[PDB]
Amino acid sequence: TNRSTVKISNVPQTIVADELLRFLELHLGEDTVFALEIPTTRDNWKPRDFARVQFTTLEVKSRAQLLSSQSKLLFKTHNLRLSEAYDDIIPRPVDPRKRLDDIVLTVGFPESDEKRFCALEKWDGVRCWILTEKRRVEFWVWESGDCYKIEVRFEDIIETLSCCVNGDASEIDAFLLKLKYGPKVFKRVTDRYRFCKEDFDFMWIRTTDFSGSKSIGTSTCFCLEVHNGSTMLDIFSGLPYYREDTLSLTYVDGKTFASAAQIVPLLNAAILGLEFPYEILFQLNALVHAQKISLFAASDMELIKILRGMSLETALVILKKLHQQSSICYDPVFFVKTQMASAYKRLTEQNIMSCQRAYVTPSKIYLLGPELETANYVVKNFAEHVSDFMRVTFVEEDWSKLPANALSVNSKEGYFVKPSRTNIYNRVLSILGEGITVGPKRFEFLAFSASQLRGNSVWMFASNEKVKAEDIREWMGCFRKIRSISKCAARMGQLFSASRQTLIVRAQDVEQIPDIEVTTDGADYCFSDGIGKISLAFAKQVAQKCGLSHVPSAFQIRYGGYKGVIAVDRSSFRKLSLRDSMLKFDSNNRMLNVTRWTESMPCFLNREIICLLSTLGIEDAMFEAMQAVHLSMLGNMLEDRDAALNVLQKLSGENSKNLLVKMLLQGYAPSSEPYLSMMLRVHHESQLSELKSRCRILVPKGRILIGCMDEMGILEYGQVYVRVTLTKAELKSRDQSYFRKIDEETSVVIGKVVVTKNPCLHPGDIRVLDAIYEVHFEEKGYLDCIIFPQKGERPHPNECSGGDLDGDQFFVSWDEKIIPSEMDPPMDYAGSRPRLMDHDVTLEEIHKFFVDYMISDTLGVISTAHLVHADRDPEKARSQKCLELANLHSRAVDFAKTGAPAEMPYALKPREFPDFLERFEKPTYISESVFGKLYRAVKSSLATAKAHRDMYGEKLTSLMIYYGAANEEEILTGILKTKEMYLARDNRRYGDMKDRITLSVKDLHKEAMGWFEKSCEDEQQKKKLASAWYYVTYNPNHRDEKLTFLSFPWIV
Length: 1052
Description:
Elements: E1 5-8, H1 17-27, E2 33-37, E3 51-55, H2 58-69, E4 82-84, E5 99-108, E6 117-119, E7 121-131, E8 136-142, E9 147-153, E10 157-163, E11 174-179, E12 184-189, E13 203-206, E14 221-225, H3 232-236, E15 242-246, E16 251-253, H4 278-289, H5 295-298, H6 301-308, H7 312-324, H8 332-339, H9 342-350, E17 352-360, E18 365-374, H10 378-381, E19 389-394, E20 412-413, E21 416-417, H11 423-434, E22 443-445, H12 450-455, E23 457-462, H13 469-476, H14 485-493, E24 500-501, E25 517-520, E26 523-526, E27 533-534, H15 536-542, E28 554-559, E29 562-568, E30 592-594, E31 602-605, H16 607-612, H17 620-635, H18 641-648, H19 659-665, H20 674-693, E32 697-705, E33 707-709, E34 719-720, E35 723-725, H21 728-732, E36 739-740, E37 746-749, E38 752-754, E39 768-771, H22 775-779, E40 786-788, H23 796-799, E41 810-813, H24 845-852, H25 859-872, H26 880-893, H27 930-942, H28 945-963, H29 969-972, H30 987-1016, H31 1019-1034
Parallel strand pairs: 6-16, 10-15, 17-19, 27-29, 33-40, 34-39
Antiparallel strand pairs: 1-3, 1-4, 2-3, 5-7, 5-14, 7-8, 8-9, 9-12, 10-11, 11-14, 12-13, 17-18, 19-23, 20-21, 22-23, 24-30, 25-26, 28-29, 28-30, 31-32, 32-41, 35-37, 36-37, 38-39
C-alpha cells in the first residue's frame, strides 16, 4: 500500500509496451495505467522477460493483484504474475489531493517583529507534490522554458504556519514553511517501450540557484498561496511541527535586498559607509546566518547606530548572549536595550587561537564564528592576523559530504562515456578562484592539509598591506621544484599539524650520512625512509619546554620540510644529524617543533585484525571467551571500586593522573558520590556503544608504540627486540615464560610478537617475529621503541602493507595463543607511476585537483565492501576478490599523494549489510561469522563563593546551549548522546567537535583555577575556602531555583 508500482514476472519477448497497455486497459478500467516501462538489454532492440507498470490508484493495484492471484490474466498464452516493486517509475504521489497545480509560490523572510512577511520573488503556475513515503516536497517552477525542481525535506522545515493572502481570517489561503537548511535545486536536461503517458523523457541534475536576484539563497522561509482549502488542513497536518493556530501576514516591499554576487546572504557593505569594526560585523552576519535574527531585522539604521558607539567587550558579551539563546529574537533592539596580548600567551602556553569557520553550500553560506581550536605552525610566526585566517569547508545543504552525483555526472556522448561538469563544479571553482568577500576583506587561497583534503576543507587568508597570500606562500618554501600536482599540494599543506615550540637550530649544524638500499628480485627495497638519529643532550633540551621526565628513545619530529622519527643513540657526534631521504622541499626557515613523543597505550583488536585472524586457524571459542570475560569485568566495574581502578589503569592511559582515577582507589561506595557515579555510568554507556559500533577488545598483554632502527646490524631477518612499560597486571605477577623483568618499570618480552598496521586488508601482513634479548642492545637504553633489524632481504615496515618510519604506531602483542604455523607472503608495495608536468603550477591545476578529490573518492566504501565480502564467503581473505579489494584500497590510500583514482567497480559493491552496522535503511542480513557471534553475545548481555558559582554555571549553560548540549555529563565527557544527521555519518567531524569542546572546557577549568588562586592566594586559607565551597555545594538547601551544577569545586 506504500507504492502503486507493480512488477510483472514474465511477458512475451515479442510484445511492445502499447500492446500490454491496451491489454491492461481492456482488463482493467479505462486509462488506469500511468506508466509502463520494459527494460532492455540493448539500446532499443532487446527487451527483457519482465516489466514494471505503475497504476493511478491503489484500488486499481489491488484489483490487478486479485486478478493475477486468480490467474485471470492471460496475455498471449502467458500468465502474468504480479509482485511488488522496489521504486516507482516516476516519483509521483498516489493521491488526487496532494497534487497542486497553478499556485503562487513566493520566498522571503520576516521583516520586523510584527507579523509581516516580505516577498522577494513571486512565481505563478508552479506545481507542488507532497510525498510522504520519501519525506520530501517537490516544487516545479517553470522559468524561461526550462523547469526546475525544488525539494524540501521534512527535517529541513522546523515549523509550519497557516496564513492567508486575501486578508480574510476565516479563509486560510497561505502556508509559511520555516526552513532551517536550504532546499535542493535541480534542472531538466534534454520511446518504443516506454509510454509514460507524458513527456518525462529527461533527467534531473543538481545545479546552482537560477534566480537572477538570488532570492532563494537569501530566503529561509517559503510561502504557498493556495485556495480556501476546506480539507487542505488535513493534508498539511502531516508536515512535522505543525501549528494549529491562525496567523495573518502583511506583504512588505523587500525587492531592494538583491545581491548579484556568488555569496548571497552576506550583508551589503556600501549601505553602512562608515568605520564599523570587522569583528562586530562578522558576529552580526553569523547571527543573521543562524536561525535567530532575520536579515531585515538587523539591517535597520537604529541597530548599527546603537552598536557603532559602545565598549567592545560589553558589545561582544551582549552579542554572544543574544546568539546563545535558542529562541528566535524578532526585535533585537529591545533585547540589547534590556541587556544594558592574551593571544600570544595562549599560543605559547597551550596553542589556543580563535579561528573563523565558514561553510559554503550551493544555496547560501554559513558562518560559525570565533570557535576556539588548536594552533598550527603558521599562526606562530603570523600571530598578528589571527582574524585573517578562515577555515572554509564545502558541504551540502544538510552540512554533509557532497555526493559523487552532485559533481560531474556521467553521460554517454559519442563512442565513449564523457563526464559533464555541473554548475556546482563551476561554482566551487569560481569561489576558490575569486574568494569570499566578507565586509572590508577578501580571503584568498593559501593551502590545504592532508587531513583537510579528505574532509573537503581549505584554509583562506585575507590579503593585507603588510602581508599577503603570496608572501606566506614564498615564506613557507619554494614549491616550483615539484612538477607534480598532488605532490606539490601535499608538501605545501603538510606543514600545518599542531606542534609545540622549542629552541631554534641553525643551518650550520647539519651533516649528510649515507643511507642503505638493497635490491632483491628486481625490487627496490629501502630501509631508511624516515629514520633519524638524536643525541641525549639534544633530547634533554627538547624535553625541557614540554615537561617530560623520562626521555623517550624515539619521537616523531619535523623541521624545515623534513619529516620523520628519530632515535636516541649513545655514540653521536653533535646534537643534530640529518639523512638524505628526508628533505621534501627546500624551506626558508628551520624552526623546530615536535608533535608526539611516546604513549604506552594498550592496544586493541579492531575489526580488520579479527577478520584477517579468522583464517590462520584461530577458533571462535577464544574470542567469545575473551569478549565474555571483558563484559563481565566491565559489568562489575560499577558496583566494585577495585575493578574501576583496574579498568581505568589498563584501558585508557598506562600512567595517567586524574581526579576520578585517584578517588577510584580510595573512595566511598558507588551508591554515594553521584558526581563520580554519573561519570562512571556515562563512561560505561560510551564503552558499550563503542563496542556495538565496532569491535574494540581490551587486551592487557599488548601495546601500540612507534618503532625505529639502530646502526648495529646484529639482528637478522625476523629478529627484533620488544620492550614496554609495566602495567598493573604486569606488576601483580611478573613471573612468566615470555616476560623478562629487565627493570622495575620496563619488562622485556621473549614471546612471538606479530606486527600490523591500523589499515590492513591482506593476509600477508601477518608476520610472526621472535623477540631476542641481548645485553648489547639493552646497554644503549632503548624504551617504547620496537627495534627493527638494519640488515635483511626486505624491510619490516614494507611487510606491513608497505609502511614507512614516519612516526606511525605499530600493533605489538606478546600473546602465546596465536597460530604462527601459517605464513603468507605480503602483497607488493609497488605504487603507480608519478605524474610530472612539463611546466610550473599556475595555481589553477591545484584547485582542479582539490575539487576532483570529491569525485571518484571510494576510500570509505572499499573497506566496507571487503568486510562484507569476507563475512559472506568462507575461507575469507584467500580468494582473488579480497586481493583485488586490498589492491584497490592501497591505490585509494595512495590517491592523496599521487593522482590515481581507485576506480571502484559496480559489481563489487556489497548490496547486503550484516547486523553490526548502523545501515538500517539498507537491507540487513543475519551474519553467522565471529563478528555475528560477538554481536549476539553483546546483545544478550545488554538485554564571594556564590558569585563565582553563578558565573561558572552561566558559562557552562552558555557553552551547552551554544554546542547544543542539554546535560553536564555529555559536555564534560565530550560525547553527545544526540547528534545531527551529518555528525553520525562520519566520525572525523564529530571527533573534531569533541576535541574543540574538550579544549573549551579545559580553558574554562583553567580560568576557574586562576580565579581560585587569585581569590585567596593563601594555602591553608585556600584549603579552608575550598572545603567551605564543597560544603555549600553539597547542601541541598542552598540551591536556588536555577539549575545548580555540582561540577564547580571538582577541579583537582
